[PDB]
Write an enzyme that holds these catalytic residues in place. Structure first.
Site, mmCIF file in Angstrom:
data_model
loop_
_atom_site.group_PDB
_atom_site.id
_atom_site.type_symbol
_atom_site.label_atom_id
_atom_site.label_comp_id
_atom_site.label_asym_id
_atom_site.label_seq_id
_atom_site.Cartn_x
_atom_site.Cartn_y
_atom_site.Cartn_z
ATOM 1 N N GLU A 152 -1.284 2.776 -2.444
ATOM 2 C CA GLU A 152 -0.595 3.307 -3.596
ATOM 3 C C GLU A 152 0.253 4.497 -3.130
ATOM 4 O O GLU A 152 -0.255 5.616 -2.932
ATOM 5 C CB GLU A 152 -1.560 3.782 -4.681
ATOM 6 N N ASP B 14 -5.784 4.936 -1.464
ATOM 7 C CA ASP B 14 -5.423 5.992 -2.414
ATOM 8 C C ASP B 14 -4.500 7.099 -1.869
ATOM 9 O O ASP B 14 -4.642 7.522 -0.725
ATOM 10 C CB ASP B 14 -6.731 6.651 -2.914
#
Ligand SMILES: [Ca+2]
Ligand SMILES: [Ca+2]
Ligand SMILES: [Ca+2]
Ligand code: NA
Length: 481
Positions: free
Chosen positions: A259, A229
Site C-alpha cells: 500500500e 503496510d
C-alpha cells in the site's frame, strides 16, 4: 479461473475476539462466491487489545502471550487464527498476512536519548540543538521472554520518534547519529517518519531481524502471501530485498501487494521501478476516480477511467479496489465511493481482464462506525457481480468508452469455460443503449442481465454484435441465459 481477493476486515469491527472464528465460518461462503484469497488484518499484539493492529507492539505475539494486558489480539488467539487458515486452505483459499514494519508502538519503557527536532515540513531540516529526551524505545516483551526470538529493541534500532516523555512534547525527533532512510517518499523532504518509533533500516541488525521475522511469520501461519503496510515511509530497496528473501527461504511464490498511498501515478511508478516490479501495489488513483464519479452527479467524464491508473499501465502489478479501511467513513483519508455508484465500480474491477480485484469486507457487510454515513451491507448487490467474474468474465475484451456517461466492455468467453462471455454497461448519468461486439461465436444466443436491473434479454446477431441497454445511474451485465 479468475482470482479475487477480499480484504477481510473493516476499521470499526467490535473488539470481541471473535473475528478469526467469523472468518473460519465464512470459508464456504467465500469459496462459493469465487474469493480465492483473503488479506487478514495484522495478527500480532498491538498497543492494547483494541488496537486495529497497526500499533505493532510485538510481531512474535500472535495472540499467544499475556502482554499489554491481554493474551488475544482484537481478533482472537493464535489457535483460532490457525484453525481459520486451515479452513480456508481446505477450500483452496489463499491467505495474505498484513506486514507492519515501518514502526513499533507501545514500548515497554522509555530510554534517555540525545536528539534534535526536525522541521515537520522538511524533515531534512534540523530546527533545534541536541538535547536529552525520554523516548518510548525499549521493547523487552515481558510476557514472551525469549520464545521464538531473543531480539530486544532499543532507541538505536530507530531513527526517531514524535514524543518526548520527559516534557510531554509532541515534535518530530531524530536520534543522535541517525539519518532518515532513503529512498522513501520525498513528501515533506523525506517521509521516512510517520508515527511511533521509526525503524532504522540503515541498521544491519534490524534489517537481518525483520527478514528473519518475515520467514518465521510465513511459516508459523503457513501464509500464501503478504500485504505491505505504509511502504512510502520504508526504504524501497529494503522492501525489495525483504520480499526476495522470504520467497527464497520459503520456496513459495508469496504473492505480495504494497500500500503506497499516493494520488499521483508518477510516485507509484517510481516505487515499482525501485523495487524492480517484484510485487504489486493497490491502485489508489483508480479509487479516487471512483469517488469522483460517484460524487459528481453524472458530471464526471467516464472516459477518464481508462487513463491515469496503475492498472492501465501495469496490468499485472495492480490490485484494484473500491474502498478500504483508509477510505471508509470517519477515517483520515475518507473518500468513500457513494452507494449508488458502488456496484458500477465493482462491475469495473471484477469483470475487466486487467488487475487483481479486491472486495472490501465493509462493502459486503457494512461498516460499524458511528457516523450517520456508514457503508450499508451491499453483499446482495455485489454477489451477482462476483458470479459474473467467477463464471463468465473470460476471453478477449472489447472496450467502448466513447461517451461521457455510458461506457461498457465485453468479454467474448473462452471455450474452456462453458457458456462464458459477458457484456457490461455502466452509466453515471441517464440510461441508454450501446451496440457492442461479443464475438461471432456467440451469434444467436439469448443473453440477459445477471444483475436483474433490466428484464428484457438481448439476442446476439449474426455478426456477433448485440444492442445492450442500461438504466440511469446503473449497471447491467449480460450473460447467456
Ligand atoms: Ca519509516
Ligand atoms: Ca536511518
Ligand atoms: Ca458523466
Ligand atoms: Na527509518
Amino acid at each position: 479461473l479468475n482470482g479475487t481477493l477480499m480484504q477481510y476486515f473493516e476499521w470499526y469491527m467490535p473488539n470481541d475476539g471473535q473475528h478469526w472464528k467469523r472468518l473460519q465460518n465464512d470459508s464456504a461462503y467465500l469459496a462459493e462466491h469465487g474469493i480465492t484469497a483473503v488479506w487478514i488484518p495484522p495478527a500480532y499484539k498491538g498497543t492494547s487489545q483494541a488496537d486495529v493492529g497497526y500499533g505493532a507492539y510485538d510481531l512474535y505475539d500472535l495472540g499467544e502471550f499475556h502482554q499489554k494486558g491481554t493474551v488475544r489480539t482484537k481478533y482472537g488467539t493464535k489457535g483460532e487464527l490457525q484453525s481459520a487458515i486451515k479452513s480456508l486452505h481446505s477450500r483452496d483459499i489463499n491467505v495474505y498476512g498484513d506486514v507492519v514494519i515501518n514502526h513499533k508502538g507501545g514500548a515497554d519503557a522509555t530510554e534517555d536519548v540525545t536528539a534534535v527536532e526536525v522541521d515537520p515540513a522538511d524533515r531534512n531540516r534540523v530546527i533545534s540543538g541536541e538535547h536529552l529526551i525520554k523516548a518510548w524505545t525499549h521493547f523487552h516483551f515481558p510476557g514472551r521472554g525469549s520464545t521464538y526470538s531473543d531480539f530486544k529493541w532499543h532507541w538505536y534500532h530507530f531513527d526517531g520518534t514524535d514524543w518526548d516523555e520527559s516534557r510531554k512534547l509532541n515534535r518530530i525527533y531524530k536520534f543522535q547519529g541517525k539519518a532518515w532512510d532513503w529512498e522513501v517518499s520525498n513528501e515533506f523532504g523525506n517521509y521516512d517518519y510517520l508515527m511511533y518509533a521509526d525503524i532504522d533500516y540503515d541498521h544491519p541488525d534490524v534489517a537481518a531481524e525483520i527478514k528473519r521475522w518475515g520467514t518465521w511469520y510465513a511459516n508459523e501461519l503457513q501464509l500464501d502471501g503478504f500485504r505491505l503496510d505504509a511502504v512510502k515511509h520504508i526504504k524501497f530497496s529494503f522492501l525489495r530485498d525483504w520480499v526476495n528473501h522470504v520467497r527464497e527461504k520459503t520456496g513459495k511464490e508469496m504473492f505480495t501487494v504494497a500500500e503506497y498511498w499516493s494520488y499521483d501515478l508518477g510516485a507509484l511508478e517510481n516505487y515499482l521501478n525501485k523495487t524492480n516490479f517484484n510485487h504489486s501495489v493497490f491502485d489508489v488513483p483508480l479509487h479516487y476516480q471512483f469517488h469522483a464519479a460517484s460524487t459528481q452527479g453524472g458530471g464526471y467524464d467516464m472516459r477518464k477511467l481508462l487513463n491515469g491508473t496503475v492498472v492501465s499501465k501495469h496490468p499485472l502489478k495492480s490490485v484494484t479496489f473500491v474502498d478500504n479501511h483508509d477510505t471508509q467513513p470517519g477515517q483520515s483519508l475518507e473518500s468513500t465511493v457513494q452507494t449508488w455508484f458502488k456496484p458500477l465500480a465493482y462491475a469495473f474491477i471484477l469483470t475487466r481482464e486487467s488487475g487483481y480485484p479486491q472486495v472490501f469486507y465493509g462493502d459486503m457487510y457494512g461498516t460499524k462506525g458511528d457516523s450517520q454515513r456508514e457503508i450499508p451491507a451491499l453483499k446482495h448487490k455485489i454477489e451477482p457481480i462476483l458470479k459474473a467474474r467467477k463464471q463468465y468474465a473470460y476471453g478477449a475484451q472489447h472496450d467502448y468508452f466513447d461517451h461521457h456517461d455510458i461506457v461498457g466492455w465485453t468479454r467474448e468467453g473462452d471455450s474452456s469455460v462453458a457458456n462464458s462471455g459477458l457484456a457490461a454497461l455502466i452509466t453515471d448519468g441517464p440510461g441508454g443503449a450501446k451496440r457492442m461486439y461479443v464475438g461471432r461465436q456467440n451469434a444467436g444466443e439469448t443473453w440477459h442481465d445477471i444483475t436483474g436491473n433490466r428484464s428484457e434479454p438481448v439476442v446476439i446477431n449474426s455478426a456477433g454484435w448485440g444492442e445492450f441497454h442500461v438504466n440511469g445511474g446503473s449497471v447491467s451485465i449480460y450473460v447467456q441465459r
